[PDB]
Amino acid sequence: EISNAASQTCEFIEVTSLEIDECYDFLEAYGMPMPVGEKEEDVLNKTIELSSGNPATLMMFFKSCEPKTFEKMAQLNNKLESRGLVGVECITPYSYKSLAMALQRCVEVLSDEDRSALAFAVVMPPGVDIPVKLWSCVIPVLDDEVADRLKRLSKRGALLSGKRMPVLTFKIDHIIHMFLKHVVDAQTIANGISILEQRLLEIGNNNETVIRPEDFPKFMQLHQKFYDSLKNFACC
């Protein structure tokens, strides 16, 4: 948005996440051996999914992949889930030991309220499209105002992810999640999980390539699996 400052022929070029195929290319590039068994190509989709298309962390990964084996690569794939970006922070051509130090700043600049919406999008699902009202449950304040905060949030560090139709929905990626995991207040994780089971059951008393229907918002139990892990985190 700093460009709104300039009244001009402002022209823009956005550098999106390294797509799944290009990532392969990057590994291939510095000598990393390509998969065979199904749970190895899958191991590498774990890294690429986790490192939500990210040059820098992809690089922290390789540099920290020591013997080079898929075996030690999945070691890191575990280490990444239970210790955050801090599990893979390394000396890299990057100015930052890990992408979290970089994003910190991206988190400091933020409108105070937007800092809040962000602090909360932890209790979401990563790599999942969920409607504006399904977000209206956890975010501070017609709750369209939520979307304005969520646009500002993706516009200002590419922290979220907009998708206009089928229905106005947003999404949070994965690097951008484990930044928040080991970084938002250990209580506020469990508070967001709970403020959600509440407004969800409130949607309960009013009565793949597919968006979640309005007949079925009432059960985020669909993502029960990851919700169960995040819960094991906050509460201990």
Binding site: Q104, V107, E108, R115, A119, V183, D185
Partner: peptide
Amino acid sequence: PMFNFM
């Protein structure tokens, strides 16, 4: 303490 530094 809601974050770190922040």
